[PDB]
Amino acid sequence: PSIKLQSSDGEIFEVDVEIAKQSVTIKTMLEDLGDPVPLPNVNAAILKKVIQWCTHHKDIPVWDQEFLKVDQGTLFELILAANYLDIKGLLDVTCKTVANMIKGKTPEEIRKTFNIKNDFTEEEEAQVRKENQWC
Amino acid sequence: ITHLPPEVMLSIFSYLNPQELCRCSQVSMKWSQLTKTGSLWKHLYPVHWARGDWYSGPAQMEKRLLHGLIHNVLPYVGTSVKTLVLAYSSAVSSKMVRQILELCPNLEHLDLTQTDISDSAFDSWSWLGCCQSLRHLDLSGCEKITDVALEKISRALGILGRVLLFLSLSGCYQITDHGLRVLTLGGGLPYLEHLNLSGCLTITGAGLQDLVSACPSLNDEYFYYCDNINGPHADTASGCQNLQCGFRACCRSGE
Amino acid sequence: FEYLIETLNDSSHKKFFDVSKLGTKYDVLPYSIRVLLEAAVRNCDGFLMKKEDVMNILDWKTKQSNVEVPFFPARVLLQDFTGIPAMVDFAAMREAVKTLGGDPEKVHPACPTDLTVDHSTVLKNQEVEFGRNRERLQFFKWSSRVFKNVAVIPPGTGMAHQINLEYLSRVVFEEKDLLFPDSVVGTDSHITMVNGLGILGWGVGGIETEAVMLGLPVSLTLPEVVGCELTGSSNPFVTSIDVVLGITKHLRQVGVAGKFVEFFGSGVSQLSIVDRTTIANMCPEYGAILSFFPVDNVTLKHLEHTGFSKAKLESMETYLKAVKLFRNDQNSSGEPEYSQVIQINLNSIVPREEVHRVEEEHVILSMFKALKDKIKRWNSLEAPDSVLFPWDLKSTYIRCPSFFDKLTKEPIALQAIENAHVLLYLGDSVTTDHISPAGSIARNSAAAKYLTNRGLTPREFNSYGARRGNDAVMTRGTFANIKLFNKFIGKPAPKTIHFPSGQTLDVFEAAELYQKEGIPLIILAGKKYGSGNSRDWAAKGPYLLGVKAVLAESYEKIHKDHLIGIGIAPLQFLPGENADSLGLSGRETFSLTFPEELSPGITLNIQTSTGKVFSVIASFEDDVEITLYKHGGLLNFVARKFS
Ligand code: FES
């Protein structure tokens, strides 16, 4: 029929059971207790996108390629939501997208695109740069 | 990207070839330990990689790669290596192989076709089970291996272990009846479905009958051996594949 | 050039072509271009050997490597069994001439062939290899009995390659009171060894020998001669191998690549014939084509020992001196003008007569006469003696091919290909090892399905080269290399797509389904189609599959001629175009029409079923190839002359 998912911000979302059948954690949480189930680890701004992806696969694609074009603060939140719901398809397609964002890039600009802190010391940085080649 | 748990960064670090996997290794101190977990270095092709082909799939610049991933990678990964394809290598000695086979004990697929390999490249294989769970072993063209390499291969498979599914001694013209009577020890090979002895011209059908009587799963379409010999399955097996071939050894020219 | 035929002296009766009367530039040529000019002046029949090509080997000072000339050898060597595809073709031409109103006995090779079969447990394998090579040895025995030119050296002699080639040496030929110098091009691996004895001979592929036995000449660009002056007596303690490696090392560093290395000077008389043959047999080491040691007094003092009589050696002297092919070590009057001389003083060799004086009356004289009586299982082997070969119909080794079916003398007009279907769609650098079969027969191939219907076990499938007399096995291995990258399939699989039926099966099984429907075939390829050496069935295979033309961006020059001489029109895309510049996927129907009077290098329009016309260059070089194509091939053209 319809299952009720509650986000972190107090809002309740309704969706069909076959949609939540792909959510392995929900599929395992719907065969033991037998509608108002809360999800306090995913925000509604990410639920609106994860349910949008999940309803498309009710049965890399270009629809996924256009759907996965957002800010990193939202893409990585989507990945953290797919890890919590164990949606293997979404998790795998977002892993593919992120690993595509790393294809052919020097280790210097990786930190610039992903906003990483160079937490190296010169005695290790010279040891790490020396052993990763053979390259 | 830092809020992601390590189990998701490990999944992200799977669509990256080993060149990108080592570029990412010098971004942060967490990735430096996280790109050498072992689930990312299962299959390694040191000859395709030092050619522009970074495959890392299920199944010169070259000396630098074999010297790099022998002190920089294989000690750290290091026991989670599944395959190792050194086929048609320009710079691979019996020393650069004795040091890879000592760090990969869970190897599943060796491939040493047409390499300057002697029967001393298997000296690291002595504790009776060294590289068990080995499924594929391709030594086609290593004409320098005698029946002493097979005494270390028949020991480095274990006991019933002995899960070899492929054996391609195709050109190793120096193995004899003792080189095959030793493979039928402990087991012998009960899963072997392919036995390419096409080129070993100095074995005898009496010593090959003893080998075939210990490989019950042997497919006969994939049982090649010398044409000038009277081994088993004469009306169902195949003949030598090294006819009209300059690469591999052959007792006749087939011209 | 029938006016230089001067009679020799009063020795017995002989005549010869006195090339010395060609001008004041003949005494200037090297001694290896004089052999080319002599062989060119007596075969100048106007069709194959032009007259514009005799005044092209004579103008050698200015017409070096930038010009190509033909060469008419005096004989042909063929290795162990590389002569089967030629002798089977002649045995089939005998029948094709019989069933045409012709005498099946004029059919002989156009030059003396020598089938050196003993070339290319250790003893227990010999009996099995004989029992395996029994039908082919029987065919060689019949062919030696039947054809006047052909001669066979049976398997088992002394010992591999060295004095068998000196026993066949006939340095001055006799053919109907004519005299001319020897020349031996063939598929023997040690065939350059004859150069250290005054015999201009190099190595060619199997197709080129098979085409020289049919009257066509070997093509060749005017080489550069690097005449290596070799003066001074060697040091009192040097060996033969030391001097040999010294000369070889001095020639390797100067870099003689694809050029004649004729030797001359006053120290050449110190090199024995066993040393000249050694320096000649090592041409691939310093990268040369030949190392010609002209005929001098040492050569004849060697011939006197080995086989020949005095009444023959005096005539040889007189001929070689009257035509200026004799190099006097102490009477050098006419000195050549090599394009790049090299000085080698033999006083610069560090590690003689005591060993050279031995081989004069010692074993050499005995070894040659012992081999003369070396020529057990060969004169014990039943073989036919009839004019036509008694073909065995249950045979899988020797089969009469279908090149002459049907022959129909006075050839028909040029048939236009109509509604062909691309059999193969290939890439760039398609070597002849992908076209021609070789190696063991694959257990899952078309040839294995053929040989299994004949009742052969999988271990009785021989190699693909041990069944080169059987044309069915050979055309079932054409384009059946597991590394064949067919662009209809993608991945490198030895298969193709039958278009009217849609299925994916072997190349032979597709060409065969195309044959039953009467649909011609073509082939699309890329750059340097047919690269590499010339293997047999590299042009026979495609022709017997049903191919009528080949489309490629560029062929190898050696393979374009073998395609023309089998009846496969080799076509090139206009400069700039290719397959991926016209929208051709390879699934249309191409239609040609050779208009009339095929001039060399003519452009002809190929049409399609998708309404896409495009011009394509008919890569015909000269009128010899245009005529070989108008006659449906070289074998048909030759068989029409015997009828
Ligand atoms: S290797 Fe012995 S038969 Fe080919």
Angle separating helix axes A44-56 and A72-85, nearest 10 degrees: 70
| Interface membership of B243 toward C (CB under 8 Å) | yes
Pairs from C367-373 (Cβ < 8 Å, separation ≥ 24): C367/C158, C367/C163, C368/C163, C368/C166, C368/C167, C368/C305, C368/C306, C368/C307, C370/C158, C371/C157, C371/C158, C371/C163, C371/C164, C371/C167, C372/C167, C372/C307
| DSSP designation for C586 | S
C324 with C456, same domain?
A: no
The DSSP string of C589-638 is EEB----SS--TTEEEEEB-TTS--EEEEE---SHHHHHHHHTTSHHHHH
Q: Report yes or no: C180 and C278 within 8 Å, Cβ to Cβ.
A: no
Tally DSSP H helices, then E strands, for chain C. Answer: 22, 21
Contacts of C483 in chain B (CB under 8 A): none
Q: Give φ, ψ of B184 to 5 degrees.
A: -95, 50
Structure tokens at B78: 């290091």
Query: In A, which residues are within 8 Å of B1 by CB distance?
Result: 72, 76, 98, 114-116
Contacting residues of A for B69, CB less than 8 Å apart: 134
Q: Which of C129, C78, C145 is nearest to C383 (CA)?
A: C145
**Domain for residue C214, yes or no?**
yes
**Cα(B98)–Cα(B250) distance, rounded to whole angstroms?**
28
* Last residue before each gap in chain A (C to N over 2.5 A): 34, 59
Amino acid at A52: Q
Q: How was this structure determined?
A: cryo-EM
Other C-beta atoms lying within 10 Å of the C-beta of residue C191:
23
- State the sign of the Cα–Cα–Cα–Cα dihedral A49, A55, A60, A61: negative
Nearest to A110 among B11, B27, B68 (CB): B27
Query: Is the minimum CB–CB distance between A63 and chain B shorter than 8 Å?
Result: no
Last residue in a domain, options C316, C348, C372: C372
Using a 10 angstrom Cβ sphere, with 0-12 exposed, 13-18 middle and 19 or more buried, the burial of residue C397 is buried
Mutation test of the interface with chain A: which of B3, B27, B30, B41, choosing the one with the most A Cβ atoms within 10 A? B27
Domain ranges for chain A = 1-135
Has residue C263 been placed in a domain?
Answer: yes
User: In this structure, are residues A4 and A12 in contact, taking their beta carbons and an 8 Å threshold?
Assistant: yes
Structure tokens at C559: 């393979």
* Separation between Cα atoms, residue A131 and residue A123, nearest integer Å: 13
Total domain count, chain C: 2
Helix (H, G, I), strand (E, B) or coil at B72: coil
Shared domain for C349 and C448, answered yes or no, is no
C160 C-alpha to ligand 1 centroid (Å): 21
> C120 and C217 share a domain?
yes
Report how far residue B167's alpha carbon sits from residue B171's, in angstroms, rounded to the nearest whole number.
Answer: 12
Do C475 and C603 share a domain, yes or no? yes
Residues of B in contact with C443 (CB under 8 A): 221, 238
| Whole-number Å distance between alpha carbons of C439 and C465 | 7
Q: Which domains does chain B have, with CATH numbers?
A: 40-224 (3.80.10.10)
- Is residue B244 within 8 A of residue C464, CB to CB? The reply is yes
Q: How many CA atoms lie within 13 A of C170 on its CB side?
A: 15
Which tokens in the block code for residue B37? 């977990």
CB–CB contact B254 C439 (8 Å): yes
In CATH, what number is assigned to the domain containing residue C477? 3.20.19.10
| Residue C15 counted as domain residue | no
Domain that holds residue C362: 76-372
CA distance C50 to C62: 19
Mutate to test the pocket of ligand 1, among B170, B173, B197, B240 (most ligand atoms within 8 A of CB): B240
Looking at the partner chain, which of B227, B238, B255 has a beta carbon nearest the beta carbon of C120? B255
Closest residue of chain C to B201, computed from CA coordinates: C121
Domain boundary among C372, C404, C434: C372
**In angstroms, what is the resolution?**
3.0
Note whether C290 and C193 are same-domain residues: yes
Distance from residue C123's CA to the centre of ligand 1 (Å): 15
Which residue owns the Cα nearest ligand 1 atom 2?
A: B226
Residue C515 makes CB contacts below 8 A (sequence gap 6+) with: C546
C549 within a domain of the structure (yes/no): yes
Q: Is residue C224 part of a domain?
A: yes
* CA-wise closest residue to C411 among C100, C15, C27, C5: C100
List subunits contacting chain A, requiring 3 or more Cβ pairs under 8 Å.
Answer: B
Chains that touch C (3 or more CB pairs under 8 A): B
Question: Which residue among A76, A110, A134 sits closest to B72, beta carbon to beta carbon?
Answer: A134
- Evaluate whether residue C17 is within a structural domain: no
Q: Measuring CA to CA, which residue among A89, A76, A4 is closest to residue A46?
A: A76
Describe the crossing of helices C634-641 and C623-630 by its angle, rounded to 10 degrees: 80
> Amino acid identity, residue C200?
L
Ligand 1 neighbours, Cβ below 6 Å, are B 199, 201, 226-228, 240, 242-243, 250-252
Query: In Å, what is the CA distance from C132 to each residue of B248, B252, C125, C453, C461?
Result: 22, 12, 10, 20, 11
Cβ–Cβ under 8 Å, residues C628 and C564: yes
In the complex, which subunits touch B with 3 or more CB pairs below 8 angstroms?
Answer: A, C
CATH code of the domain in which C368 resides:
3.30.499.10
Strand order in the sheet with B195-196: B43-44, B83-85, B109-111, B136-138, B166-167, B195-196, B223-224
Residue C24 lies in a domain: no
Which member of A76, A103, A125 has the closest CB to residue B4? A76
Q: How far apart are CA C580 and CA C341, in angstroms?
A: 50
The reply, when asked if residue B104 is annotated as ligand binding, is: no
Distance of alpha carbon C468 from alpha carbon C463, whole angstroms:
9
C31: in domain: no
Rg for chain C, CA atoms, rounded: 26
Asked whether residue C611 falls in the same domain as residue C476, the answer is yes
Contact between B31 and B20 (Cβ < 8 Å): no
Which domain-ending residue is among C372, C387, C405? C372
Question: In this structure, are C258 and C157 located in the same domain?
Answer: yes
Query: Amino acid identity of B82?
Result: K
> Is there an interface between A and C (3+ Cβ pairs < 8 A)?
no
What type of residue sits at position B55? Y
Instruction: Calculate how far, in angstroms, residue C342's C-alpha sits from the geometric centre of ligand 1.
Output: 47
Helices (H), C169-218: 206-212
Which positions in chain B touch C459 (Cβ < 8 Å)?
227, 234-235, 237-239
For residue B243, give the nearest of C81, C82, C440 by CB distance: C440
- Side chain identity at C344, as an amino acid letter? I
CB pairs under 8 A between A and B: 88
A113 inside 8 A of chain B by CB: no
CA separation, residue C156 to residues C102, C149, C379 (Å): 38, 22, 12
